[PDB]
Amino acid sequence: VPRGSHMEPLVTHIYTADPSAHVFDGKVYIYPSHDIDAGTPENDMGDHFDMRDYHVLSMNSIPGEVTDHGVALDIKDIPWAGRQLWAPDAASKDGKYYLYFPAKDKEDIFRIGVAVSDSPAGPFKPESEPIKGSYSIDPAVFKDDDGKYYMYFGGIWGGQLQRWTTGEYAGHDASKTDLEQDDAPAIGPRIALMSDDMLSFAEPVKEISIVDEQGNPILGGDHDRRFFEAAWMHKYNGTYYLSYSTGDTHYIVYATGDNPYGPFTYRGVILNPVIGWTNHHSIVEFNGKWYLFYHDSSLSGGKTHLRCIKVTELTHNADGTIETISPYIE
């Protein structure tokens, strides 16, 4: 049956989260987390998110029938991974499809790996080790108009980004949150140009600067605006849009810049807070309309770790501003 007409859950037979949407082969492919009621301890490091596989979804139209393509990747088959298959993304280059995914290695450190297929629907064969120089969570692999591909990534608190300031993991007894200096600039998300073969980074990882409208860094204490997790990149009218979740303040916000690396100037809110703690989205153009894919905890009756993906239309103004979506108004 067709789905996606009035912000209803796109699928209900499994719990789904963290939707990363792409247009491949004229269809919308969605790469979400597959939530399960693991019953694991709930805490600020996110141990209650104990996902173990990925299912790829696809739609031929919006609204439309949603196809679940089965298990595309299972954690038991990822040689380096110990636990926690968190928000994934995909890319397409030269007839191959690449699934990028965050998982904890056997020392309980989040890294990002890649798995490879000949189909956007998978299934995918994981590389035996994670990407060298990767860390933390939430990859977004963005193909720019010039054919260069960039991985945006990172997440604070349970995503461990705050433990990576030196290029080496600070340890399990290091900060559980951020830099713990609220008057310093907030931690920024990471970016690296991808290698030609899509399996590695082509440069040392860079940190993205996010500033306010005056050009001053967004500060660590500014939880309404500062980066938490769920980076996404899209382009509109030649401008680069870095959007992301603010975490404990529950917003998707956006910031604009003139190149992949920024700096990005904070503009405003994309999506107001949803049912359930997390807020994770993607923004995609399909048949000349822009869509915001997102999730909430509505289907589970409010359980933060049992989510369902949804979609709604997103409106850019010609001046590059985006109209804020409030999830439960119409």
Ligand X SMILES: O[C@@H]1[C@@H](O)[C@H](O[C@@H]2CO[C@@H](O)[C@H](O)[C@H]2O)OC[C@H]1O
Ligand Y SMILES: OC[C@@H]1O[C@H](O)[C@H](O)[C@H]1O
Token pair, residue 44, equals 């600020």
Q: Please say whether the beta carbons of 89 and 31 come within 8 A.
A: yes
* Ramachandran assignment for 118, one of left (phi > 0), alpha (psi -120 to 50 degrees), beta (any other): alpha
The answer to the question of residue 100 lying near ligand Y (CB under 6 A) is no
**Dihedral sign, Cα of residue 167, residue 173, residue 178, residue 179:** negative
Q: Please say whether the beta carbons of 245 and 280 come within 8 A.
A: yes
By CB under 5 A, the count of residues binding Na ion is 5
The answer to the question of residue 86 lying near ligand Y (CB under 6 A) is yes
The answer to the question of residue 304 lying near Na ion (CB under 5 A) is no
**Type of residue at 167:** G
Instruction: Give the Å distances, CA to CA, from 36 to 40, 104, 121, 293.
Output: 10, 17, 21, 20
Closest approach of Cβ 199 to ligand Y, in Å?
A: 21
**Type of residue at 24:** F
Does 83 carry a binding-site annotation? no
The answer to the question of residue 324 lying near Na ion (CB under 5 A) is yes
The answer to the question of residue 232 lying near Na ion (CB under 5 A) is yes
Closest approach of Cβ 230 to ligand X, in Å?
A: 8
Q: Residue 270: what are its φ and ψ, rounded to 5°? A: -90, -50
- Nearer of residues 3 and 280 to ligand X, judged by Cβ: 280
Concerning whether 18 is annotated as a catalytic residue, the answer is: yes
Concerning whether 74 is annotated as a catalytic residue, the answer is: no
Closest approach of Cβ 307 to ligand Y, in Å?
A: 7
- Binding to ligand Y by CB under 6 A, coded x per residue (else -) over 36-75, reads -------------x--------------------------
Q: Please say whether the beta carbons of 103 and 83 come within 8 A.
A: yes
**Three-class SS state of 194:** strand
Binding-site positions for alpha-L-arabinopyanose read: 18, 44, 87, 138, 158-159, 280, 307
Binding-site positions read: 18, 44, 87, 138, 158-159, 280, 307
Residues found near ligand Y in the complex (CB under 6 A): 17-18, 33, 49, 86-87, 137-138, 155, 229-230, 278, 280
